[PDB]
């Protein structure tokens, strides 16, 4: 058989396996996945609705939080789930077809599908409640989201390859992921951030991607000076190149 057809076979096999293990069997995890964004909205909107109305009166808070959260949740999942991909499937790593790249690709596909479903559900719910839920510019939003996908998957593969040993180091991944929820422009607009903190704030590619996605979503949204797509695109490209090279070096050392 060709490598391509056996590739579809093995990726379909690990995709259904990963759906089985993540969904709990009885399809109970969908409630958790659906409930985290709405719980985040319910916590988030009860203290800063008035502050946001003072800041940006033309933009509704819930749609702003949908566009700020769901891409960030998708990126966080793409990092976390793919980082710990090798250890979960360790017991079945000797079938001559179950190389780790297939496992990380299957996890990435599963997470992309799940979060895209959640995105569609959230947009439909927002439209059902009388909010604004059609992006004025669609395919630029799709391109920014694709850049986010490439960056997140690349970072996840890089961390999975680098930290095959010393799993304690995985901690300083997820513990470091929690500040990224606050520093990036997810829950509150970065318009209110004082400019003297602005330069270091520009070092976050996720902030650039979130701001560009929001700009492509809403009509007449202003971008800050220094926000661009070139920096996060180059970050994603370099990280993907580094991750692929590092996996190619240590390809044979991820079997036991």
């Amino acid at each position: 058989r060709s490598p391509w057809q056996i590739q579809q076979a093995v990726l379909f096999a690990l995709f259904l396996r990963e759906l089985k293990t993540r969904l709990g069997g009885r399809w109970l995890g969908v409630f958790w996945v659906l409930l985290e964004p709405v719980a985040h909205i319910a916590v988030m909107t009860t203290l800063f609705s008035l502050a946001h109305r003072a800041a940006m009166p033309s933009i509704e808070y819930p749609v702003f939080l949908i566009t700020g959260l769901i891409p960030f949740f998708m990126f966080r999942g793409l990092v976390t789930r793919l980082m710990e991909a090798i250890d979960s499937n360790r017991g079945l790593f000797a079938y001559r077809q179950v190389k780790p790249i297939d496992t990380v690709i299957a996890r990435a596909m599963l997470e992309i599908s799940l979060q895209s479903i959640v995105y569609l559900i959230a947009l439909g719910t927002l439209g059902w409640l009388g909010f604004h839920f059609l992006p004025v510019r669609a395919l630029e939003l799709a391109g920014v989201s694709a850049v986010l996908i490439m960056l997140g998957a690349s970072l996840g593969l890089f961390f999975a390859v680098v930290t095959n040993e010393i799993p304690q180091a995985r901690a300083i991944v997820r513990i470091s992921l929690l500040p990224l929820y606050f520093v990036s422009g997810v829950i509150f607009p970065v318009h209110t951030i004082p400019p003297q903190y602005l330069p270091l704030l520009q070092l976050n590619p996720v902030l650039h991607l979130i701001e560009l996605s929001r700009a492509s979503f809403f009509p007449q949204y202003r971008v800050l000076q220094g926000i661009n797509l070139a920096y996060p695109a180059g970050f994603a490209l370099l990280s993907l190149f580094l991750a692929l090279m590092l996996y190619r070096l240590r390809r044979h050392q991820l079997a036991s």
Partner: peptide, 29 residues
């Protein structure tokens, strides 16, 4: 808004059917 109320009632009823079916499936075993 008869169609609107009917559709949202369908959504909530299906959601409650799903949650009660999940609860029943968990407690049967």
């Amino acid at each position: 808004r008869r169609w609107y109320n009917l559709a949202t009632l369908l959504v909530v009823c299906c959601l409650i059917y799903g949650v009660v079916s999940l609860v029943v499936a968990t407690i049967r075993d």
